[PDB]
């Protein structure tokens, strides 16, 4: 019983950590894709000029 309560509390900790990584990954994807599009358009402008 004591070990089961300890496991339940640790699973709560794992749930909060999973929520934190899920709320970080989307912003990481957004910044990477925005940087990619900006670099692509700058290279296109310079080559055309």
């Amino acid at each position: 019983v004591q070990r089961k309560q300890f496991l339940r509390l640790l699973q709560n900790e794992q749930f909060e950590l999973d929520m934190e990584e899920a709320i970080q990954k989307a912003e990481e994807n957004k910044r990477l894709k925005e940087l990619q599009l900006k670099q692509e358009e700058k290279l296109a402008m310079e080559l055309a000029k």
Partner: protein, 426 residues
């Protein structure tokens, strides 16, 4: 001051009793540690009804928690509110009944009842003025129906001048989780009729209807079903715990609901239930509560009250609130639905008002109803009982434990006499 003693049995009774003590601890501001952490002072004026004082300022429930299967004792203890429950208050056996009323009532549960009678007597005599007893169990299981009815017979002989309320889980009409479930429930209704003062019928499929249509949920599991019935449990003993304009306890409800000793099979309802999308867009007002209360979709039983006739109606209102609109709306529904009410009892409706609403909600109402439409619940299982008993099947698990054949015949005979007694007064 007027303490009530909670009692539970079976797997269903344990999973609903843990949820019952969660809302009371939230209502009285009791932390999962065991102390008190609240902001008002009316929560401590009547806290001895459910909670016993101890050292450390620790309030512990006045409940006994019994199951023949030790598997469910872990989940109650390892739940979010498991350390509040007293470790002495768990009584368990080594082997489960396994959906058999014969083992649960005559052989396996016959030795554990003497061990738990010491526990329930110790809790009863510790109260200065015991209000009564309250039980929640399930008729579809061996432990809840076999041994829970054994406690009903033993407590009734030991405390005759008391009041006993039961919250029994009736078998579901559409989907049945047990093949021998008509045997386990028919043999328990016969013991229920003559040894119980109030009986409420709760079915899981009508809980699913409320969670599908009224709540608009996609996964409302057994836990979310337990939240609805636990609010009804907390709402029916409201005036004992909190002061109000017009108080009515369990006995004051019983004296207005039971015109004959064979008519005590009720069907509950909880009024303020909405959806998450429509949460902010409807005003919580007395006409809105009384419109949702009397509808059949809100009701907590597998019986349509249109097919029958209402006999006597209860309503327990909570919150700071006014009495002209209560009396006007609840005379209006009696005036308009004259065909749905009996004419041999005038003023079929009883009104109770409290001051303190449930937490997070402005105003609440609990419906307790006696109706002759509850006889079609017994008609469905009786025709299932007969259709199985004609071929004498699944019987060697019942006659192999010392039960005679006549017990089934007297069980169907009293139960047919009960539905004939409901039909005459219709």
């Amino acid at each position: 001051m007027r303490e009530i003693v909670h009692l539970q049995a079976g797997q269903c009774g344990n999973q609903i009793g843990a949820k019952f003590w969660e809302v009371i601890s939230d209502e009285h501001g009791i932390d999962p540690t065991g102390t008190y952490h609240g902001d008002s002072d009316l929560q401590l004026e009547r806290i001895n009804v459910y909670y016993n004082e101890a050292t450390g300022g620790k309030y512990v429930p006045r409940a006994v928690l019994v199951d023949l299967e030790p598997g469910t004792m872990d989940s109650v203890r390892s739940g979010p509110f498991g350390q509040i429950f007293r470790p002495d208050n768990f009584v368990f056996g080594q082997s489960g009944a396994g959906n058999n009323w014969a083992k649960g009532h005559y052989t396996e549960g016959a030795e554990l009842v003497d061990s738990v009678l010491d526990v329930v007597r110790k809790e009863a005599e510790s109260c200065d003025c015991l209000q009564g007893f309250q039980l929640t169990h399930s008729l579809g299981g061996g432990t809840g129906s076999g041994m829970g009815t054994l406690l009903i017979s033993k407590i009734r002989e030991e405390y005759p001048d008391r009041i006993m309320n039961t919250f029994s889980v009736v078998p579901s009409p559409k989907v049945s989780d047990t093949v021998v479930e008509p045997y386990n429930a028919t043999l328990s209704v016969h013991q229920l009729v003559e040894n119980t003062d109030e009986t409420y019928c709760i079915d899981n499929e009508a809980l699913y209807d409320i969670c599908f249509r009224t709540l608009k949920l996609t996964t409302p599991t057994y836990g979310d079903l337990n939240h609805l019935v636990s609010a009804t449990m907390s709402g029916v003993t409201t005036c004992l715990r909190f002061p109000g304009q017009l108080n009515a306890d369990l006995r004051k409800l019983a004296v207005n609901m039971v015109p004959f000793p064979r008519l005590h099979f009720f069907m509950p309802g909880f009024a303020p239930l909405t959806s998450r999308g429509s949460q902010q867009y409807r005003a919580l007002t007395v006409p809105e509560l009384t419109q949702q209360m009397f509808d059949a979709k809100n009701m907590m039983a597998a019986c349509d009250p249109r097919h029958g006739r209402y006999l006597t109606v209860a309503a327990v209102f909570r919150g700071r609130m006014s009495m002209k609109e209560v009396d006007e709306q609840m005379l209006n529904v009696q005036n308009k639905n004259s065909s749905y009410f009996v004419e041999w009892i005038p003023n079929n409706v009883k009104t109770a008002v409290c001051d303190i609403p449930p937490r997070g909600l402005k105003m609440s109402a609990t419906f307790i109803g006696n109706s002759t439409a509850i006889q079609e619940l017994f008609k469905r299982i009786s025709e299932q009982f007969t259709a199985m008993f004609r071929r004498k099947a699944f019987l060697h698990w019942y006659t192999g434990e010392g039960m005679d054949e006549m017990e089934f015949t007297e069980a169907e005979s009293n139960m047919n006499d009960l539905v004939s007694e409901y039909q005459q007064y219709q």
